[PDB]
A and B are shown apart, each in its own frame.
With several copies, the nearest count.
Chain A
Amino acid sequence: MLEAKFEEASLFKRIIDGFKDCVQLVNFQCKEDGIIAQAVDDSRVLLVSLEIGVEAFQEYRCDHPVTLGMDLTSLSKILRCGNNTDTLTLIADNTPDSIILLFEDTKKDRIAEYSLKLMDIDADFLKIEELQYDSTLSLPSSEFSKIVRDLSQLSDSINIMITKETIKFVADGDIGSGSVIIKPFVDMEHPETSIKLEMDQPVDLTFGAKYLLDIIKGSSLSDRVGIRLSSEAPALFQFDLKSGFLQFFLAPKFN
Chain B
Amino acid sequence: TLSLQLPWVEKYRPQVLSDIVGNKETIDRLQQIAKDGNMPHMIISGMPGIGKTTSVHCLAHELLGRSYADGVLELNASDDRGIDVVRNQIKHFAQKKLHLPPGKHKIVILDEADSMTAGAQQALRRTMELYSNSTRFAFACNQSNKIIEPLQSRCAILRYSKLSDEDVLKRLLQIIKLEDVKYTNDGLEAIIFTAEGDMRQAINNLQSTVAGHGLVNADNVFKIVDSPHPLIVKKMLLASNLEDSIQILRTDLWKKGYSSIDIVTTSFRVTKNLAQVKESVRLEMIKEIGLTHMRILEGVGTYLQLASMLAKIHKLNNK
Contact between A and B in the complex (any CB pair below 8 Å): yes
Instruction: State the A residues within 8 Å of B (CB).
Output: 25, 69, 71, 74, 95-97, 117-121, 174-175
Complex contact B96–A119 (CB within 8 A): yes
Once the chains are docked, how many angstroms separate the CA of A74 from the CA of B95? Answer: 13
Complex contact B134–A120 (CB within 8 A): yes
Report chain A residues within 8 Å CB of B96: 117-120
B95 partner, pick from A95, A96, A97, A120, beta carbons under 8 A = A120
B99 at the interface (CB under 8 A from A): yes
Complex contact A175–B92 (CB within 8 A): yes
Complex contact A71–B98 (CB within 8 A): no
Once the chains are docked, how many angstroms separate the CA of A175 from the CA of B90? Answer: 11
Report chain B residues within 8 Å CB of A119: 92, 95-97
Once the chains are docked, how many angstroms separate the CA of A174 from the CA of B94? Answer: 11
Report chain B residues within 8 Å CB of A74: 92
B99 partner, pick from A97, A121, A174, A175, beta carbons under 8 A = A97
Instruction: State the B residues within 8 Å of A (CB).
Output: 73, 89, 92-93, 95-99, 134
Report chain B residues within 8 Å CB of A121: 95
Report chain A residues within 8 Å CB of B98: 97, 117
Report chain B residues within 8 Å CB of A118: 96-97
- Chosen A-B contacts, 15 in total, with CB atoms closer than 8 Å, are A25-B95, A69-B95, A71-B95, A97-B97, A97-B98, A117-B98, A118-B96, A118-B97, A119-B92, A119-B95, A119-B97, A120-B96, A120-B134, A174-B92, A175-B92
Report chain B residues within 8 Å CB of A96: 97
B93 partner, pick from A95, A97, A174, beta carbons under 8 A = A174
Complex contact A174–B89 (CB within 8 A): yes
Report chain B residues within 8 Å CB of A25: 95
Report chain B residues within 8 Å CB of A175: 92
Complex contact B99–A95 (CB within 8 A): yes
The 10 tightest CB contacts between A and B, nearest first, are: A118-B97, A119-B95, A120-B97, A117-B96, A119-B97, A97-B99, A95-B99, A69-B97, A119-B96, A120-B95
- With CB as the reference atom, state the residue of chain A lying closest to B73: A174
A117 partner, pick from B89, B97, B134, beta carbons under 8 A = B97
**Distance (whole angstroms) from the CB of B149 to the closest CB of chain A:** 28
Report chain B residues within 8 Å CB of A69: 95, 97
Report chain A residues within 8 Å CB of B92: 71, 74, 119, 174-175
- With CB as the reference atom, state the residue of chain B lying closest to A96: B97
Once the chains are docked, how many angstroms separate the CA of A96 from the CA of B95? Answer: 15
**Distance (whole angstroms) from the CB of A96 to the closest CB of chain B:** 8
Once the chains are docked, how many angstroms separate the CA of A217 from the CA of B217? Answer: 59
Report chain B residues within 8 Å CB of A71: 92, 95
**Distance (whole angstroms) from the CB of B282 to the closest CB of chain A:** 50
**Distance (whole angstroms) from the CB of A123 to the closest CB of chain B:** 12
Report chain A residues within 8 Å CB of B95: 25, 69, 71, 119-121
Once the chains are docked, how many angstroms separate the CA of A15 from the CA of B172? Answer: 59
Interface centre among B89, B95, B98, by most chain A C-beta atoms within 10 angstroms, is B95
**Distance (whole angstroms) from the CB of B128 to the closest CB of chain A:** 15
Once the chains are docked, how many angstroms separate the CA of A174 from the CA of B99? Answer: 16
- With CB as the reference atom, state the residue of chain B lying closest to A175: B92
Once the chains are docked, how many angstroms separate the CA of A127 from the CA of B102? Answer: 32
Once the chains are docked, how many angstroms separate the CA of A117 from the CA of B98? Answer: 8
Once the chains are docked, how many angstroms separate the CA of A117 from the CA of B97? Answer: 7
- With CB as the reference atom, state the residue of chain B lying closest to A119: B95
Once the chains are docked, how many angstroms separate the CA of A94 from the CA of B99? Answer: 11
Once the chains are docked, how many angstroms separate the CA of A92 from the CA of B134? Answer: 22
Report chain A residues within 8 Å CB of B97: 69, 96-97, 117-120
Once the chains are docked, how many angstroms separate the CA of A183 from the CA of B134? Answer: 42
- With CB as the reference atom, state the residue of chain A lying closest to B69: A172
- With CB as the reference atom, state the residue of chain B lying closest to A95: B99
Once the chains are docked, how many angstroms separate the CA of A74 from the CA of B97? Answer: 14
Interface centre among A69, A95, A97, A120, by most chain B C-beta atoms within 10 angstroms, is A120
Once the chains are docked, how many angstroms separate the CA of A69 from the CA of B94? Answer: 13
Once the chains are docked, how many angstroms separate the CA of A71 from the CA of B96? Answer: 9
Report chain A residues within 8 Å CB of B93: 174
**Distance (whole angstroms) from the CB of A169 to the closest CB of chain B:** 21
Report chain A residues within 8 Å CB of B134: 120
- With CB as the reference atom, state the residue of chain A lying closest to B130: A122
- With CB as the reference atom, state the residue of chain B lying closest to A74: B92
Once the chains are docked, how many angstroms separate the CA of A69 from the CA of B99? Answer: 13
Once the chains are docked, how many angstroms separate the CA of A175 from the CA of B99? Answer: 16
Once the chains are docked, how many angstroms separate the CA of A171 from the CA of B95? Answer: 21
**Distance (whole angstroms) from the CB of B207 to the closest CB of chain A:** 22
Once the chains are docked, how many angstroms separate the CA of A97 from the CA of B134? Answer: 14
**Distance (whole angstroms) from the CB of A105 to the closest CB of chain B:** 30
**Distance (whole angstroms) from the CB of A26 to the closest CB of chain B:** 12
**Distance (whole angstroms) from the CB of B69 to the closest CB of chain A:** 10
Once the chains are docked, how many angstroms separate the CA of A106 from the CA of B182? Answer: 70
Once the chains are docked, how many angstroms separate the CA of A220 from the CA of B306? Answer: 66
Report chain A residues within 8 Å CB of B99: 95, 97
- With CB as the reference atom, state the residue of chain B lying closest to A118: B97
Inter-chain pairs besides A69-B95, A119-B97, A175-B92, 13 sampled, C-beta below 8 Å: A25-B95, A74-B92, A97-B97, A97-B98, A117-B96, A117-B97, A117-B98, A119-B95, A119-B96, A120-B95, A121-B95, A174-B89, A174-B93
Once the chains are docked, how many angstroms separate the CA of A25 from the CA of B92? Answer: 11
Once the chains are docked, how many angstroms separate the CA of A97 from the CA of B92? Answer: 14
